[PDB]
Amino acid sequence: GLPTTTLPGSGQFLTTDDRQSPSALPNYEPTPRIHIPGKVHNLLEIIQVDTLIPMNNTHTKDEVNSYLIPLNANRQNEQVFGTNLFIGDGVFKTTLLGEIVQYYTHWSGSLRFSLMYTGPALSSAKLILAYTPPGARGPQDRREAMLGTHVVWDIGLQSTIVMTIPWTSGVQFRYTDPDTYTSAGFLSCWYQTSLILPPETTGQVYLLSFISACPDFKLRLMKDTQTISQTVALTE
Amino acid sequence: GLPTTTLPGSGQFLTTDDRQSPSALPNYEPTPRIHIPGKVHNLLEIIQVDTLIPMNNTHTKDEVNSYLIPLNANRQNEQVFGTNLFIGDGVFKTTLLGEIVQYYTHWSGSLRFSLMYTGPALSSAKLILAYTPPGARGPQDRREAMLGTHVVWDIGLQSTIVMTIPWTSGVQFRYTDPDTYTSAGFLSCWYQTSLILPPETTGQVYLLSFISACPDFKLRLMKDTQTISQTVALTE
Amino acid sequence: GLPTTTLPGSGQFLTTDDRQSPSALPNYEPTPRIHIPGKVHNLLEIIQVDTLIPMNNTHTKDEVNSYLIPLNANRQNEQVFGTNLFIGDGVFKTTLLGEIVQYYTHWSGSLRFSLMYTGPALSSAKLILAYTPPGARGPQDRREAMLGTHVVWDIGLQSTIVMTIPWTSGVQFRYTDPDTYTSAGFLSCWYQTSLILPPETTGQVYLLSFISACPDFKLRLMKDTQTISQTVALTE
Amino acid sequence: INYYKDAASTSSAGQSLSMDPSKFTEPVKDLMLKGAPALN
Amino acid sequence: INYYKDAASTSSAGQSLSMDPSKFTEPVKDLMLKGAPALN
Amino acid sequence: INYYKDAASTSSAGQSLSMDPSKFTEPVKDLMLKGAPALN
Amino acid sequence: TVASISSGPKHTQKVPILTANETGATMPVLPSDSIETRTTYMHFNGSETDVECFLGRAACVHVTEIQNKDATGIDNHREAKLFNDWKINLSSLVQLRKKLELFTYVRFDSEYTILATASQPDSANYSSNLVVQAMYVPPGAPNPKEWDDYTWQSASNPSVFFKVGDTSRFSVPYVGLASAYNCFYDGYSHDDAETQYGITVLNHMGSMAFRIVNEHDEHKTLVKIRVYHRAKHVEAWIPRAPRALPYTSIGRTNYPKNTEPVIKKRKGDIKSY
Amino acid sequence: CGYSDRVQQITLGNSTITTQEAANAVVCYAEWPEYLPDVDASDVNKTSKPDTSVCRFYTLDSKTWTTGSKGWCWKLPDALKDMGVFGQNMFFHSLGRSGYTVHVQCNATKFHSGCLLVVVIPEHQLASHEGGNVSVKYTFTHPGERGIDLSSANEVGGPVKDVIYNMNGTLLGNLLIFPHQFINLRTNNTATIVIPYINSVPIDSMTRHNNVSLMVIPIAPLTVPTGATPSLPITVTIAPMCTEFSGIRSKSIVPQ
RNA sequence: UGUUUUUA
C-alpha cells in the first residue's frame, strides 16, 4: 500500500471547502431540466436593477411615504434631500443593492442614482443632484454642493434623471460596513430654480429615488448579513 | 511518503457507497456460469407484466373472490367498480406493480389496466372504463365519468380490454406513497348498455382486473417497503 | 479505495513545511497589483546597503555621538578605533547588517567597511585601516596592524574610503553568534601621519563608519533574533 | 483503476442497459402483434 | 479526476461567465437605446 | 499538481532569482562607476 | 475588460442621463455619461457573486439532542430522545433561508455534513465511543418507531454510521419532483377550503432519523447533532425582493404581529447626513 | 421617418386595445410566451390549444383609486376563472398553461399627480396576519376578478394586507426586481406587461395554484386638482396567450 | 471640419 503522511488540518470540517463526496442515492436520475425564465447566474446581474430608496426615512413606522421625497413649490436655493453613501447602512440598507451588498465585506465601482418626478405634467422644476466625494463634509448649501460632481436636472417629458455616482476612491475597495476611512462621501439634491406648480394644484409633489449598480460594480469576501436574526430554530 | 489530508466523513460507513474492498478469499475460482432462463436485468422489465388486482377489496379475509369484480345482469347506467390511483396503496398495494412501486419513492409514466370477462360466451355486455384525471372527484355517475379519458368496451370474442391510463400530471413525478398533491386521479367502470345473460344462466359473472406498467414507466429513490415487518431476527 | 499506509510523523504540525491547504475564501478575487517602488526579493539586496556603525560605543545612553569616531589633531602613530568582527554582536549588532545577520546562524563572504571624514575641507589627514585575520590578537600598535590587510587612506576631495574586509577563513562559513573557532578577526584604524587642522579651527573632528555586505555575502539557517523580546502579548 | 487481484474486489457494474421485457411479457410460441386479433 | 460514479458527487462548477443583466434590467418589448428619448 | 481551485491554496513560489540591489545601493540620477571620481 | 472608458466634454442631443423609469427598464447609464472619465480596467471576474458561491457553502440547518441511555421501561424512543427525526428543510435557519429566498426556484445537488458532539453533564468515568446512525427516510418508507426497530436495518434506505466527535459527509442529487425546488408556492395541495397554503411536498427532501447504535452505559451521554448543508451545481430563477421582516414558520411567508420597523429612521430630517 | 412609441395597438382575437400615452411594454425576463415543446413535456395527452376564443382581452371590473388607497392584488389564472371560454376550459381540464398580456389603465389630466406601481410577482405566496404557522385559506387567495383590496380589513384565515410589506414580509421598494411598470400620470396612462408561463413544472393545475400575481400599488399618492373628484378609475385588462389545456375531465368543484 | 481612437 502507498505510504502516506497526513498533514495537520486532517479531519477538519471547513464550511468553504469544495470537495467531492459519496452520493447517498447511487444511480438516481434527477428530474429533467425544463426552461424557466429569469435564470440568475450572478448577483451582479440583479444588483444592476433599480430599487426604490426609502429616502424619506423620517417616519415612526415603515410607510410608503418613506419612499416619497417631498418637493415644495416656490422654494429657491434650498435642500431637497441629503444622505451619506454608506450603501450597507442608512437609507440604502433595505434596498436590493444594500441587501446584496451586506452579504459582502468589500465593494467597488460606480452607483447609479435615479430620481423620478411624479408631479403634474403642467408643473416645472430644475433640481441639482450633487455627489460630494469623501474628505469634505455634507454640503450645507447649494453653492458648496455644486463644486462637486453634479447633474442639473430639467424636469420635463422625460420624468427620470439618472445620476451616476462615479467611483471616487484612493483605495480600490471600500467597506460595505460603515467605516470612516472607506467613506464614499455624500449625496444631496437642491432646488436649482424652484418647483412651479400649475393653477388649481396645491401641496407637495414627490420624487421617487432609485439605486442600482453600474456594470463596473464589484463585491467580494462573503459574510453573514445583520439584516436577519433568530433566537429559536423554526418549526412548520 | 505522499502528504495527504483526510476530509471530513472519513471512517464513515455509508450503506450506499460502492467502493472496492479486499477479498477474503484470494485466488478463489467461483463456480462457472451456466444458462438459466428468465434473467432479470431491470425491475422495469417485470413490472410490465400483468398481475391481478384484488379490486373486490370487500372481504373479511383475503379471498380469491377479492380478485373477482361482480357483474350483474340487466343493470343500466350503473357503476361496476371504482378506485383511486394511489398505486402504492389500496387495491394496488399487493400487486407486483404495487410491491415494486413501494420499493421506490417516486413514480412516473402510464399504467396499463386490463379487464378480462369470464362470463358465458353467449352473454353480451358493453362497459365503459373511465379514467378521471386529478383535480376532480371520483365520478358519481356515468355521464360524469365519460367526460374524462374512457374506453367503451364491447365484450365479444376478444375477452380482454386494455385501457392505458395516460400519464396525466403537471409535475414530472408522483409520490408512490399516498399524497394529495401528486394524486393520480380515479378509475371507474360503468355499464355502457348492460349485461345480458343467455337463457338457463343465472347470478353473477366476473371480471378479472390486471395492472401493468407501460414501457414509459419510471421509478426512482429506493426506499424500504412497509409491506413487510419483523420484531425478532429469524432462526432456522 | 486505494490502500494506504500512514508514515510516522502523520498529524504533526511542522512550522517549516510548505504544503497546499484549502482556501477559506473560495472564488475570492484579491485586490489588483499596482507598481510600488522599492520591491525587495532577497535580503541580500538590502544588506548591501551601507548603514552607520555606532563605533563610538562608549556612552551612558544611546546617542548620536555613538556614531561619531573622534579624531584628534597632532597625534602620530596612535589608534583611532578598534573592534572585533563579530558582526552579530558589539558595535555591529544594531546595524542593518547585524540585524539581518542575527536572523541567520551562518555567514560567509566579504564585509565592506567605509569611513567618511567630516572635518574641514582645509584639514588634512592620513589614516591606515587595518584588518587583522583571526589567530592573532587585536593589534596594540600600528607596526603590528600594518602587517595585516590594510588600506592607507589619504583624506582629500573624496571624503570616503571603502575598505573591503576580504573573506579570510578556513571553514567556509562562520557563526553569526560570537564563537571563538569562527572568529573573523579584528578591525583597527591608526594615524598614518596625523590630523592637521587649519588655523582658527579647534577640537575634535569625526569619522562616520559604515558597514555593508559585498555581493559574495552568504547567510543561511534562519533563526529567531535576540534583539527583540516580550513578556506579554500586545493589545491595541 | 482496480487496486486488487480479485474480481470480487471490484465495484458494482452499474447498469445492464440491455433490457428485454418480452421474455416475461410475451412468452408465446406464435407471434402476437398489437392490433391483430389475439386468437383467430 | 472524479472518484465517483455519480454527477452529484462532483465538486461545484465554479463560475458561469455568461451574464446577461438585460433580462432583468431591460425586459422591454421595443428596444431602448441610452441617449435616445425613452418615449417619443 | 494543485489539488485546489484557489491560487491561495498553492505552495510558496520558492525563490525570485531576479535580484537588483542597485535600486537600493545606487539610487543615483547620474551613473557612478567604481574607480571614477564620485564627484568632479 | 474595460471598467471605465475615456470620455471628454459632451454637448449633445443624446441625453443618456434622461430616461423614463416608467418603462420598468434600468438604462445602463455609466459614469462616462455623467462625468469626464479616464480609462480603467476591472481586474475582476465576479467569481464570488456567482450563485454557486453565494448559495454554495455549508450552513447549519438542523440541531438535535439525542441521548444514549438504557431503553428499558420506555414506551416511546422518539420522544425519550433515544432517536430523533428531522423533516429535511433549509427553511429553519433564517440566514440560509434569506439567501435561498432571493430566488423563486432553485435546483441544486446537496452535500450534507453531520457533526455529532457528546457531553456527559452528570457523573461519568469516560467518554463513550458512540456510533451515530443517520438514516434517510424518504416519504412512504417506515419511519423508525423504536431505537433498534427493524426500520434501522436500512435494506434499501440510505444510512450513515459515524463516530461521535467525528463527522459524516455525503452528497445527495436533486431529489425534487419538479425541475426545481419551490422556495415559494402560491397554491394548495388541492381545491379545498382548509388545505395548507404554501406548504407542499414539492420540497419534501425527505426525513433524517438519528440514533446511537451503541447499547447503554451506566452514565447518560447527551449527543447534540448538527446537520450542515452545502448546495452544489446551483441553478436559480426569478430573483425576488429580499426578506425584510423575521420569519415565524417553515415554508410560510408569515411575519410577526407588532414587528419592529426595519427602515432605519434618521437622526434629523431628510436633509441630514 | 416619424411616428410614435407612445401610440400602441394590441389586437388579440376579436379584442383590440389602443393607447396613446403608453410606456414601453414589459416582457417579463425578456421571454415571450410560447407553447410547451415536446422536450419539456411530461404529460402524454395532446394539449388543447384553444386559439382566439380564449386568447383575447378580458377587462376586469374597475377599481377606484382614492387618496387613501393602499393598492390591489390579482391572482392569475384565478382572476380569469369566470371569463368566457377561458374559465370553462380552466375548470374542465386537470392541467393548464398560459402566458398573459396584462394591460393596466389609469387616465388623468395634466393637472393630476400620482404614480402606480404595476408589478407581476411569480409565486406571490401571501402571509397570514395571524402570524405563527396560520394558513391563508383558499377562498382569500382565489378572489377572482374582484382581486384583493389591500386597503380592506383583515379576515380570519385571510392574508396580511400591509402593502408596505408586499403581503409577504418583503419591502415595497424592492418589488422593482420583479417585471414592473409605473403609471406616472404626468408621463403615462397605461402599463403593459407580457407574462410568459413561469413554473417549475411544464404544465400545472390552474385551480389550486396561481403562477403569477398582479399588484397595482399607489406609490406617489393621488393628488387631484382643486375642485376635482378625489378619485380615478383603474381598469385591468388581461389576455391569455399561448394557452394550453390538458386532461379534459368533469368540471372541477372549488370552494365557495 | 469645435471630431473620436490607435501608433511613434
Side-chain angles (χ1 to χ4, degrees):
Chain A
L2 179 68
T4 58
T5 301
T6 65
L7 296 183
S10 278
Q12 78 178 350
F13 169 43
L14 172 66
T15 59
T16 43
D17 196 357
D18 176 39
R19 304 317 309 161
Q20 297 181 47
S21 56
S23 172
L25 299 171
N27 306 301
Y28 171 95
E29 183 278 336
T31 306
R33 284 180 175 94
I34 69 161
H35 186 80
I36 306 162
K39 193 170 192 171
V40 184
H41 294 136
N42 201 296
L43 288 196
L44 286 174
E45 300 177 73
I46 64 166
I47 202 178
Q48 284 182 53
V49 175
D50 269 320
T51 51
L52 290 171
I53 314 164
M55 190 68 76
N56 194 20
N57 190 7
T58 65
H59 302 285
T60 313
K61 67 188 190 297
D62 299 347
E63 292 175 20
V64 182
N65 283 316
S66 73
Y67 292 102
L68 304 171
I69 302 164
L71 283 177
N72 299 282
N74 312 112
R75 306 282 185 90
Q76 294 190 21
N77 46 61
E78 183 172 302
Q79 198 167 2
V80 172
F81 74 77
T83 186
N84 62 60
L85 284 165
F86 296 123
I87 53 167
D89 205 50
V91 294
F92 297 105
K93 202 179 192 72
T94 54
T95 69
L96 176 73
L97 189 144
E99 285 279 44
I100 291 170
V101 144
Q102 275 173 105
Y103 270 111
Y104 294 85
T105 307
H106 311 140
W107 78 275
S108 187
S110 305
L111 297 155
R112 187 185 300 115
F113 181 82
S114 309
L115 287 180
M116 192 167 81
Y117 181 71
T118 66
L122 277 161
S123 67
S124 62
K126 285 184 204 293
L127 299 177
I128 174 172
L129 285 79
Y131 165 58
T132 307
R137 61 173 203 198
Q140 293 183 11
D141 62 51
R142 189 183 76 192
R143 185 182 295 276
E144 184 180 5
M146 64 89 183
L147 286 176
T149 299
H150 73 271
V151 174
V152 169
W153 173 32
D154 188 46
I155 288 160
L157 287 161
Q158 295 272 55
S159 76
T160 310
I161 194 72
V162 183
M163 180 190 190
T164 311
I165 300 152
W167 176 250
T168 310
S169 185
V171 64
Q172 293 93 321
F173 277 83
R174 279 196 262 258
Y175 284 114
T176 62
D177 181 61
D179 178 69
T180 310
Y181 179 85
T182 56
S183 176
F186 304 92
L187 181 68
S188 56
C189 188
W190 311 79
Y191 294 103
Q192 183 68 345
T193 53
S194 177
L195 169 69
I196 315 300
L197 284 173
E200 313 296 74
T201 62
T202 69
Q204 295 189 321
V205 301
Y206 301 104
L207 297 170
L208 302 191
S209 53
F210 310 74
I211 192 73
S212 75
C214 295
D216 75 287
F217 203 81
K218 307 176 188 70
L219 285 167
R220 60 178 208 194
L221 204 151
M222 276 184 64
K223 69 178 189 71
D224 300 335
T225 53
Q226 55 182 329
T227 54
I228 197 153
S229 49
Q230 74 185 122
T231 48
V232 195
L234 301 170
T235 55
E236 206 197 76
Chain B
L2 179 68
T4 58
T5 301
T6 65
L7 296 183
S10 278
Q12 78 178 350
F13 169 43
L14 172 66
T15 59
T16 43
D17 196 357
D18 176 39
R19 304 317 309 161
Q20 297 181 47
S21 56
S23 172
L25 299 171
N27 306 301
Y28 171 95
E29 183 278 336
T31 306
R33 284 180 175 94
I34 69 161
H35 186 80
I36 306 162
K39 193 170 192 171
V40 184
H41 294 136
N42 201 296
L43 288 196
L44 286 174
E45 300 177 73
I46 64 166
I47 202 178
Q48 284 182 53
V49 175
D50 269 320
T51 51
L52 290 171
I53 314 164
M55 190 68 76
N56 194 20
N57 190 7
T58 65
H59 302 285
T60 313
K61 67 188 190 297
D62 299 347
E63 292 175 20
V64 182
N65 283 316
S66 73
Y67 292 102
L68 304 171
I69 302 164
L71 283 177
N72 299 282
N74 312 112
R75 306 282 185 90
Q76 294 190 21
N77 46 61
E78 183 172 302
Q79 198 167 2
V80 172
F81 74 77
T83 186
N84 62 60
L85 284 165
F86 296 123
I87 53 167
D89 205 50
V91 294
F92 297 105
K93 202 179 192 72
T94 54
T95 69
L96 176 73
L97 189 144
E99 285 279 44
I100 291 170
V101 144
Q102 275 173 105
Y103 270 111
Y104 294 85
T105 307
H106 311 140
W107 78 275
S108 187
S110 305
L111 297 155
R112 187 185 300 115
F113 181 82
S114 309
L115 287 180
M116 192 167 81
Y117 181 71
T118 66
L122 277 161
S123 67
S124 62
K126 285 184 204 293
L127 299 177
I128 174 172
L129 285 79
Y131 165 58
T132 307
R137 61 173 203 198
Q140 293 183 11
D141 62 51
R142 189 183 76 192
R143 185 182 295 276
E144 184 180 5
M146 64 89 183
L147 286 176
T149 299
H150 73 271
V151 174
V152 169
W153 173 32
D154 188 46
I155 288 160
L157 287 161
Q158 295 272 55
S159 76
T160 310
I161 194 72
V162 183
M163 180 190 190
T164 311
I165 300 152
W167 176 250
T168 310
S169 185
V171 64
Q172 293 93 321
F173 277 83
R174 279 196 262 258
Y175 284 114
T176 62
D177 181 61
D179 178 69
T180 310
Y181 179 85
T182 56
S183 176
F186 304 92
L187 181 68
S188 56
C189 188
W190 311 79
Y191 294 103
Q192 183 68 345
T193 53
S194 177
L195 169 69
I196 315 300
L197 284 173
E200 313 296 74
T201 62
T202 69
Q204 295 189 321
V205 301
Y206 301 104
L207 297 170
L208 302 191
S209 53
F210 310 74
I211 192 73
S212 75
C214 295
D216 75 287
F217 203 81
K218 307 176 188 70
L219 285 167
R220 60 178 208 194
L221 204 151
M222 276 184 64
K223 69 178 189 71
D224 300 335
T225 53
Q226 55 182 329
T227 54
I228 197 153
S229 49
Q230 74 185 122
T231 48
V232 195
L234 301 170
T235 55
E236 206 197 76
Chain C
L2 179 68
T4 58
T5 301
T6 65
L7 296 183
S10 278
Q12 78 178 350
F13 169 43
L14 172 66
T15 59
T16 43
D17 196 357
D18 176 39
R19 304 317 309 161
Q20 297 181 47
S21 56
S23 172
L25 299 171
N27 306 301
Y28 171 95
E29 183 278 336
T31 306
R33 284 180 175 94
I34 69 161
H35 186 80
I36 305 162
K39 193 170 192 171
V40 184
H41 294 135
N42 201 296
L43 288 196
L44 286 174
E45 300 177 73
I46 64 166
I47 202 178
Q48 284 182 53
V49 175
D50 269 320
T51 51
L52 290 171
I53 314 164
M55 190 68 76
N56 194 20
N57 190 7
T58 65
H59 302 285
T60 313
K61 67 188 190 297
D62 299 347
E63 292 175 20
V64 182
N65 283 316
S66 73
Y67 292 102
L68 304 171
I69 302 164
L71 283 177
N72 299 282
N74 312 112
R75 306 282 185 90
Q76 294 190 21
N77 46 61
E78 183 172 302
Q79 198 167 2
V80 172
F81 74 77
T83 186
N84 62 60
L85 284 165
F86 296 123
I87 53 167
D89 205 50
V91 294
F92 297 105
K93 202 179 192 72
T94 54
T95 69
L96 176 73
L97 189 144
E99 285 279 44
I100 291 170
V101 144
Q102 275 173 105
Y103 270 111
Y104 294 85
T105 307
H106 311 140
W107 78 275
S108 187
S110 305
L111 297 155
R112 187 185 300 115
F113 181 82
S114 309
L115 287 180
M116 192 167 81
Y117 181 71
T118 66
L122 277 161
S123 67
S124 62
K126 285 184 204 293
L127 299 177
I128 174 172
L129 285 79
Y131 165 58
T132 307
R137 61 173 203 198
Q140 293 183 11
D141 62 51
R142 189 183 76 192
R143 185 182 295 276
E144 184 180 5
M146 64 89 183
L147 286 176
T149 299
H150 73 271
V151 174
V152 169
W153 173 32
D154 188 46
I155 288 160
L157 287 161
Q158 295 272 55
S159 76
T160 310
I161 194 72
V162 183
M163 180 190 190
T164 311
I165 301 152
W167 176 250
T168 310
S169 185
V171 64
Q172 293 93 321
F173 277 83
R174 279 196 262 258
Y175 284 114
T176 62
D177 181 61
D179 178 69
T180 310
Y181 179 85
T182 56
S183 176
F186 304 92
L187 181 68
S188 56
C189 188
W190 311 79
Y191 294 103
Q192 183 68 345
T193 53
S194 177
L195 169 69
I196 315 300
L197 284 173
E200 313 296 74
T201 62
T202 69
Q204 295 189 321
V205 301
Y206 301 104
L207 297 170
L208 302 191
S209 53
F210 310 74
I211 192 73
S212 75
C214 295
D216 75 287
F217 203 81
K218 307 176 188 70
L219 285 167
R220 60 178 208 194
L221 204 151
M222 276 184 64
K223 69 178 189 71
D224 300 335
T225 53
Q226 55 182 329
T227 54
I228 197 153
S229 49
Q230 74 185 122
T231 48
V232 195
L234 301 170
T235 55
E236 206 197 76
Chain D
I1 307 164
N2 303 327
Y3 313 119
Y4 302 98
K5 298 180 74 66
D6 296 334
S9 280
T10 62
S11 62
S12 290
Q15 184 187 349
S16 169
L17 293 168
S18 63
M19 310 175 180
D20 179 274
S22 288
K23 74 173 87 74
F24 309 110
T25 56
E26 301 182 71
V28 284
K29 168 182 169 278
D30 309 326
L31 177 74
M32 285 168 66
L33 272 83
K34 188 220 298 184
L39 308 179
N40 49 65
Chain E
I1 307 164
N2 303 327
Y3 313 119
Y4 302 98
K5 298 180 74 66
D6 296 334
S9 280
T10 62
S11 62
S12 290
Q15 184 187 349
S16 169
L17 293 168
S18 63
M19 310 175 180
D20 179 274
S22 288
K23 74 173 87 74
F24 309 110
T25 56
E26 301 182 71
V28 284
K29 168 182 169 278
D30 309 326
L31 177 74
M32 285 168 66
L33 272 83
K34 188 220 298 184
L39 308 179
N40 49 65
Chain F
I1 307 164
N2 303 327
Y3 313 119
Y4 302 98
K5 298 180 74 66
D6 296 334
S9 280
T10 62
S11 62
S12 290
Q15 184 187 349
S16 169
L17 293 168
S18 63
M19 310 175 180
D20 179 274
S22 289
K23 74 173 87 74
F24 309 110
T25 56
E26 301 182 71
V28 284
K29 168 182 169 278
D30 309 326
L31 177 74
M32 285 168 66
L33 272 83
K34 188 220 298 184
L39 308 179
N40 49 65
Chain G
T1 312
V2 186
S4 66
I5 62 157
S6 195
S7 185
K10 286 171 282 299
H11 210 131
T12 174
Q13 292 179 11
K14 320 187 186 199
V15 192
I17 66 178
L18 279 174
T19 194
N21 272 10
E22 288 86 359
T23 57
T26 308
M27 285 289 96
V29 178
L30 309 172
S32 64
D33 294 309
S34 301
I35 64 145
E36 292 190 45
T37 47
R38 63 161 304 151
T39 305
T40 70
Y41 308 99
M42 284 295 285
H43 314 295
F44 186 84
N45 303 122
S47 42
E48 204 161 7
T49 52
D50 205 71
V51 288
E52 293 174 359
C53 183
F54 176 67
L55 294 174
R57 67 183 59 191
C60 192
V61 288
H62 181 66
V63 59
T64 177
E65 178 191 35
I66 66 160
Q67 300 168 35
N68 184 207
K69 61 186 178 181
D70 199 309
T72 51
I74 295 169
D75 299 304
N76 194 5
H77 300 164
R78 185 176 63 261
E79 198 194 292
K81 277 182 283 179
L82 300 178
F83 77 87
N84 197 17
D85 49 294
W86 171 57
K87 182 168 177 286
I88 308 171
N89 76 86
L90 309 182
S91 297
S92 61
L93 265 288
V94 300
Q95 191 68 55
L96 175 65
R97 187 178 175 174
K98 181 167 173 157
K99 285 209 290 178
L100 287 167
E101 284 191 4
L102 287 194
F103 313 94
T104 308
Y105 309 113
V106 287
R107 179 204 179 93
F108 54 80
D109 304 310
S110 305
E111 181 171 282
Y112 287 87
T113 312
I114 309 164
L115 167 66
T117 50
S119 65
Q120 299 87 10
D122 299 328
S123 62
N125 296 309
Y126 57 94
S127 193
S128 295
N129 292 283
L130 313 164
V131 167
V132 162
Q133 179 182 10
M135 184 181 165
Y136 180 78
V137 185
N143 192 321
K145 242 66 186 178
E146 284 192 325
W147 83 266
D148 191 18
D149 192 16
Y150 75 88
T151 55
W152 300 100
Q153 181 194 341
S154 301
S156 309
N157 282 168
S159 176
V160 195
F161 303 80
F162 63 95
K163 285 174 287 292
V164 175
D166 289 351
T167 56
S168 53
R169 172 86 77 101
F170 56 88
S171 178
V172 179
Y174 166 69
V175 291
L177 290 180
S179 293
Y181 296 122
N182 279 54
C183 300
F184 297 87
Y185 179 68
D186 182 12
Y188 298 83
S189 49
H190 62 313
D191 309 90
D192 197 31
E194 322 81 345
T195 190
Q196 280 303 299
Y197 182 59
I199 305 296
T200 187
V201 283
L202 279 166
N203 298 328
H204 208 306
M205 283 198 175
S207 197
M208 269 156 65
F210 316 97
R211 70 157 178 172
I212 297 143
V213 299
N214 295 55
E215 296 295 325
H216 59 281
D217 312 72
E218 68 169 346
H219 61 82
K220 293 178 181 180
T221 170
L222 283 57
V223 175
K224 183 151 282 181
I225 291 167
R226 296 180 179 272
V227 185
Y228 285 78
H229 174 275
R230 178 172 80 88
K232 311 191 296 177
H233 318 112
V234 182
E235 284 160 286
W237 295 270
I238 315 291
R240 303 183 69 84
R243 183 72 183 193
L245 296 178
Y247 297 103
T248 61
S249 172
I250 295 172
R252 293 175 182 82
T253 62
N254 289 341
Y255 58 82
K257 283 181 286 183
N258 312 124
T259 189
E260 292 292 354
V262 298
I263 301 167
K264 219 179 200 73
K265 197 205 167 180
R266 284 169 175 262
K267 298 291 180 182
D269 295 319
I270 195 174
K271 300 173 188 180
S272 86
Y273 302 101
Chain H
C1 189
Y3 235 63
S4 245
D5 151 303
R6 273 194 263 80
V7 181
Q8 296 275 183
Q9 181 184 318
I10 317 162
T11 299
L12 287 168
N14 63 350
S15 71
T16 293
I17 290 192
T18 64
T19 185
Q20 298 201 241
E21 297 298 322
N24 190 355
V26 168
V27 187
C28 308
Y29 310 106
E31 190 71 0
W32 277 85
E34 278 282 16
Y35 299 115
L36 166 71
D38 300 64
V39 293
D40 298 308
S42 185
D43 178 67
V44 302
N45 297 257
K46 191 164 79 180
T47 49
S48 174
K49 292 175 180 171
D51 54 65
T52 55
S53 76
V54 309
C55 291
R56 59 177 314 280
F57 279 110
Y58 303 99
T59 292
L60 275 67
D61 275 345
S62 300
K63 292 299 177 178
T64 304
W65 181 16
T66 59
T67 62
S69 291
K70 301 292 97 179
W72 313 264
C73 182
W74 290 269
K75 263 74 170 65
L76 286 166
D78 168 61
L80 297 174
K81 73 193 167 194
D82 294 310
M83 294 301 171
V85 174
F86 175 87
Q88 298 296 340
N89 279 301
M90 178 170 156
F91 281 114
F92 270 105
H93 291 85
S94 179
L95 302 168
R97 163 192 173 101
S98 166
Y100 307 97
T101 293
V102 163
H103 186 82
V104 180
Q105 294 133 285
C106 184
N107 62 41
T109 72
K110 283 187 170 69
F111 293 87
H112 278 76
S113 167
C115 192
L116 293 168
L117 172 67
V118 176
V119 56
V120 164
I121 307 166
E123 302 290 356
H124 187 216
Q125 188 183 326
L126 304 181
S128 179
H129 63 88
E130 295 186 37
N133 69 338
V134 177
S135 187
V136 186
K137 289 183 181 184
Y138 182 97
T139 184
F140 298 109
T141 310
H142 294 71
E145 72 146 308
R146 178 179 56 98
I148 313 163
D149 180 15
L150 276 78
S151 311
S152 280
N154 295 332
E155 296 191 42
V156 180
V160 74
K161 289 179 183 182
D162 302 326
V163 68
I164 191 66
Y165 296 129
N166 302 333
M167 309 166 78
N168 66 0
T170 64
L171 279 164
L172 173 62
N174 292 320
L175 276 189
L176 272 64
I177 190 57
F178 293 114
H180 74 279
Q181 264 209 118
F182 293 92
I183 301 180
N184 197 13
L185 295 176
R186 69 176 317 279
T187 307
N188 186 213
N189 70 1
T190 42
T192 320
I193 303 179
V194 185
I195 322 162
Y197 185 73
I198 311 171
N199 209 347
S200 55
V201 296
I203 196 160
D204 207 355
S205 177
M206 280 206 145
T207 47
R208 76 183 174 191
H209 175 240
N210 291 307
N211 286 281
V212 289
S213 192
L214 171 70
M215 293 198 80
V216 179
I217 301 149
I219 311 297
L222 184 66
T223 316
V224 297
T226 315
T229 294
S231 295
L232 283 184
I234 299 170
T235 305
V236 170
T237 311
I238 314 166
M241 69 200 302
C242 301
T243 311
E244 277 176 325
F245 295 104
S246 167
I248 189 155
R249 163 215 73 186
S250 73
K251 200 186 180 188
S252 63
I253 303 96
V254 296
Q256 276 198 350

